[PDB]
Amino acid sequence: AAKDVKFGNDARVKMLRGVNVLADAVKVTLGPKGRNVVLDKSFGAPTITKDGVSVAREIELEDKFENMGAQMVKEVASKANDAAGDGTTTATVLAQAIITEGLKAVAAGMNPMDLKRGIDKAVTAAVEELKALSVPCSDSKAIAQVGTISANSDETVGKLIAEAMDKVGKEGVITVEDGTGLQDELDVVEGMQFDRGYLSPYFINKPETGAVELESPFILLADKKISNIREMLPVLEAVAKAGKPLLIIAEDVEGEALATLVVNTMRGIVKVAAVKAPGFGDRRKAMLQDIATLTGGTVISEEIGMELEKATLEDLGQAKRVVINKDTTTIIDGVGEEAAIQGRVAQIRQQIEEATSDYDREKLQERVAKLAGGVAVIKVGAATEVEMKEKKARVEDALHATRAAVEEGVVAGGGVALIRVASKLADLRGQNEDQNVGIKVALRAMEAPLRQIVLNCGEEPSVVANTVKGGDGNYGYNAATEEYGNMIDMGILDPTKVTRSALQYAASVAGLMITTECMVTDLPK
Amino acid sequence: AAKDVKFGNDARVKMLRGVNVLADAVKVTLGPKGRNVVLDKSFGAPTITKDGVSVAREIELEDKFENMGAQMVKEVASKANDAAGDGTTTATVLAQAIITEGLKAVAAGMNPMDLKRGIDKAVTAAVEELKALSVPCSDSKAIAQVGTISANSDETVGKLIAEAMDKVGKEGVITVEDGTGLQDELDVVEGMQFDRGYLSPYFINKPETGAVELESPFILLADKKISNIREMLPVLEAVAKAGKPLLIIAEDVEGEALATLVVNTMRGIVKVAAVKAPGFGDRRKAMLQDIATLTGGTVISEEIGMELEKATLEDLGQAKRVVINKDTTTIIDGVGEEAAIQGRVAQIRQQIEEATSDYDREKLQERVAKLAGGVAVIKVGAATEVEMKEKKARVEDALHATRAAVEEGVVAGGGVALIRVASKLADLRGQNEDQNVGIKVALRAMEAPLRQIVLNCGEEPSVVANTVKGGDGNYGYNAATEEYGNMIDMGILDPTKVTRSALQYAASVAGLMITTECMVTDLPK
Amino acid sequence: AAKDVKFGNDARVKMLRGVNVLADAVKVTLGPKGRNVVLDKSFGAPTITKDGVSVAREIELEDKFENMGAQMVKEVASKANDAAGDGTTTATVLAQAIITEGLKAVAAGMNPMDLKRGIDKAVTAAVEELKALSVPCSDSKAIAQVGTISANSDETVGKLIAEAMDKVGKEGVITVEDGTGLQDELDVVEGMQFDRGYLSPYFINKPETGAVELESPFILLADKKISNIREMLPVLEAVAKAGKPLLIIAEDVEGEALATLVVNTMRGIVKVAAVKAPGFGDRRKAMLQDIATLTGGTVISEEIGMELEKATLEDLGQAKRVVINKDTTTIIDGVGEEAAIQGRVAQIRQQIEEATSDYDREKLQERVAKLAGGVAVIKVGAATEVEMKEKKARVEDALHATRAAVEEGVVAGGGVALIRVASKLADLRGQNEDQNVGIKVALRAMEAPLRQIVLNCGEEPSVVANTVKGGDGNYGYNAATEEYGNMIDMGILDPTKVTRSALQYAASVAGLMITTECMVTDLPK
């Protein structure tokens, strides 16, 4: 429809105001002494939470320009969350600082593109410096330490994470469900995991987790696109009679089929969840055959000849449980016979032996690795259901943090890592004065998280920041105890991956922002 | 949609205004001389009541921020009422005092987190001091005394409560009903009680009680989640033909099933109430088997093999009466044969004998206790139905107060308990000046209930407060007679549990309130 | 009345708006292709002028803050004009450029004091570089050249300035006069020249010149302050009877005496104008004695004993003509006998011989220099009275420019001198980033005059500026002919003194304004 365009520095200040609103809302909760923030609920009592993610997701502004600023900063922060598992608040704070300083500079007659280039140079130098300061977390002891730290200083969950870590190797799959007994139970069952996200958010049966947990679902294997729901009618009737959930893995799903399945989930006569086919091409077909072996199902392909209409319940695979992460899937305890899986593993091993291409060999090796390693299962054990839920959440976030730490490393948390790299990079110079100003903007903006944490603690931000910059190594300021020392010794730790991703995404969105003039919006009605 | 965000001290004063409105509305009715408050009725004459709970539930403001403050304070006060059985007004008054003083302090550049920590330390000290000041109420004479006091000084109801307490022991179940004759009737019939709340408030057939009373309902036992209503169709047809109510206990009930059953209750062709399955895992299954033994029903589980479609009226259990409390459920006079129940008791006793884990042993012991103790039955006795209703309500509240007193104890009521604790804790000091100020704020806020009671009585609040603080022990101010003396002597008593819970929840909501900066709401339209 | 105070960047932008208005108003006329600007007149037609000074003096704004900004910039520009004789427009343009860039940088969150220090360093380097680039104008040929150039390319006036310059030496005194005949005349008559300004602007009998020309005025010499007008009554009566203008040279004049003299001048009975006594102490008294020697007057001092009441017309001195400029005075052809003046010269020469102090020797030497050198008179010669006036104005401005050039030197005019200095100082660095930014601000602001001249010519400013910066030496852009070359060869020349003073005063006012935060004014009524 009709749109109104505002461009120039007026658009910039509008977007800055939107980002300021969102950044204040999020940064209030930063740090161990983070102040609570109350969220509206359409009905009943409002919630109260220190979680930055929820408050961030709840922010929408009235006037459109501020809304776009907040929405796009929020989207980049959510991308950072999905990348690692935390650091939305840090990313938003960094974005706010960089935006404020860079837009001030641009309003000061600064070349925005050179500012972007300088910020990019500064952030890549900071990233490599941070990698230099990373501490390995390969040993099981540090793994238990970080697991304990992430879950509010609980050693049992750290021990469980370390045990499962040992069970399923370095790059194993970890899943957690609610254990019946008071004792924690760890077991290894043959499972699956591939990086594919759900078709629509509406399949999420548990919105507070953002996943689709199904019990004993009948999986359907298809190498074809779901053009028409007529093909889905017989299997839909069969599963409706079976009265059990189901999974759909297919080459593609058309939009109308998606609307039909959304309707069939709102009705929920059938618990249907679909997801893109993993792999690609011949690799996709081979791994779909592997899934068929795991779940005892059968692949339905147009090229081979069989059609989805001629699909029985026996043709479908099955598994004890599946979970559809926002960008990943998990299969647990496939019904398929283990001997068949072992034979498939041997076949793919022979394919590896005869493999000559390097990347094809890598694909085959990771295929057999994820085929044979399986999925670990962690069962929470305590007395009361309330503690089932809270300890399950703690185990989930601790697992995310621990795997992030294992992937890259662990650096002194509390925001002091950014301060350390900033002090290390005090003499970084660009190609000219413009990029130099951009570099300085980035360097002084990387101090925002620690300053905000200290301000939330009620102490003086600048004094603490200067004292930390004076020190070297990992010597930072404990927010909780208000005592200086070494973060590694006192356990305040953050994964290298989360800090790196948050910093990079904040820099990316900030640089993208600094170089925008035109805005288009619908008329305010 | 678009959301208005207000953060800083303006959000604080908005929430303070909302809390002030709600607190005035509730505190007006506090005390024996509490002034009446008139409420709105969409049709007919307005209702006039001194009950703080109703007026509290009917308060919610126009502008959103004050509404949030009122709603969160109301929710916490209602949580206190559910936990104990009274003290909604006391909790609201304490919350108002603490919020006013704490926000007044925060406006002076005071560290909110230290204020919260000081308040928490002060309330913990107050709780332990109150426990020290508690008077045991284990003897039957004090039980009768508190029963008489709670029910507007009626000795007959106190005697009945004492008799039932003797019948079903210290932690027995007690239920109230309507007796045909003028004489009061007492009897013990095997029954159930477990802490589970209703799925939906819409199941409440008697909103003024907040419960679901059913006469001769057909109970259905399920260990599975109610995914589809097709499974519920045959049993629903059977019970529609039977023309009797029913109970539903299941592992879970999905939202679509909840909507379907809400529709089936609005039609009310079938009188249906659903509730979560108590226990957990194997313990859950074992107690579901116990329920089947009590009610003569049968557990329908996927794992065993049978399905809910093959549900006959014989398969369902039955009982003479059930009541679905907000967070509890009660079964009365299960049809099942007593010999089978005794055999199950013996089996669980053998399980206790062979039990090794202390927790499993405790679960088995409480299982046999709840299986064998049964449920007490108290039938109100008088002539007119008006007195049936009022005496039933009196028995209900007296039973609540008496069980609360038995659980923890009884302290001098009328608000002097908090005054005594405050006088005892006059020298409590925090880690610094900030926590000390928070401690003083809490201490002077604990005097609010007595001051409000005296103000309602029309006398000078501060004079009476000082006179009470001068005394020691339980000496206080009888508001009703306007005379001083030991409150225990003249029987102005409150349970220790209700005062402790009210104070603790007021402190918790105050700590949440003070540390709030950002508010997000929907735009006023 | 009350006063409105505005501080912060809002006052800065108010001043910026005022400076912008005044600056573009003045700069429209800059350059040989300067565009006309109309002015005000309460009666009759408005006046159209290309003179920056006339338009500048007329500008004042309606709102007080930007009015203060314009007023102070105008005052500093007028100071620049008085210092040398031109460069008001250049000073205003430089001030505008520096103010815009510096206030932009200050809005960029940059330390204003460091900006001021960097600008001061840059302008000092620019001044010394300009002195290095100066071309001497000692020889009579260059004197004639600059005289011709200043007076719109008229060789006769430059020639006349050359002969007068030779007559009265390098530091001589030149006065312009109206000549009866068409031939130009030159004569040397003993006269004074001391740097004192009029007591009041109201003495100005010819406002378009800003001077006080008196014909055959009597002179009253006094070493005392004029406390009371009673002392002035007898001499006032004597000069009123004489019907001739009066000149008052005295130690000081009190404010009420000034009001009395203003009233008398407005009455027109006496054409009196007063001036401060030059010198200091004994030196002042000695030069007053010298003035008495010239004019045949007598010094009336309290210490000697005589009083101003006992003053006859004989006691007063006399001269053929006097002119009182803004801060300058001229006495022409004192009546007193030349032999007495020569005797006084011999006395002061003996004092020089016996002088031991260096500065006293300098004072005596300059005193004999002004006593013996006298004053040259250049009588303009043409036919019509209109050309009398225009050629007299041309002679005035050419004399000012020529003496300015003789004092310091002559650098390539047309604004390219600043461009050359800026190109020479491209690598000047400050102590830190802020001073460096200020240096760059000044360096890029020195290009404003040439850019504005080119823009007034209608050509492309930046292209011409780049082309000039590419060249070295005095190579620049002729605005009139739109041809490049050497400014010296084509005669486009400006004195070193005027450019230096304009740049220095623009830098001074810019430094003062950049470091301004608060402003206090009267309420707008």
Residue numbers in the entry:
A (entry chain C), B (entry chain B), C (entry chain L): 2 to 526
What does the paper say about this structure?
Gro-EL is a ring-shaped E. coli chaperonin protein complex that helps mediate ATP-dependent polypeptide folding. Gro-EL forms a stacked heptamer formed by 14 subunits, with a molecular weight of ~812 kDa. Expression and purification of the AAA+ ATPase ATAD2B complex in E. coli resulted in GroEL contamination that co-purified with our target protein.
The GroEL-apo dataset comprising 9,541 micrographs was also processed using CryoSPARC v.4.5.31. The processing scheme was similar to the GroEL-γATP dataset. A total of 513,428 particles were extracted from the micrographs with a box size of 256 pixels. This class was used to generate a homogeneous map with D7 symmetry and was further classified into 5 classes. The final map generated from non-uniform refinement had a resolution of 3.7 Å according to the 0.143 FSC cutoff criteria.
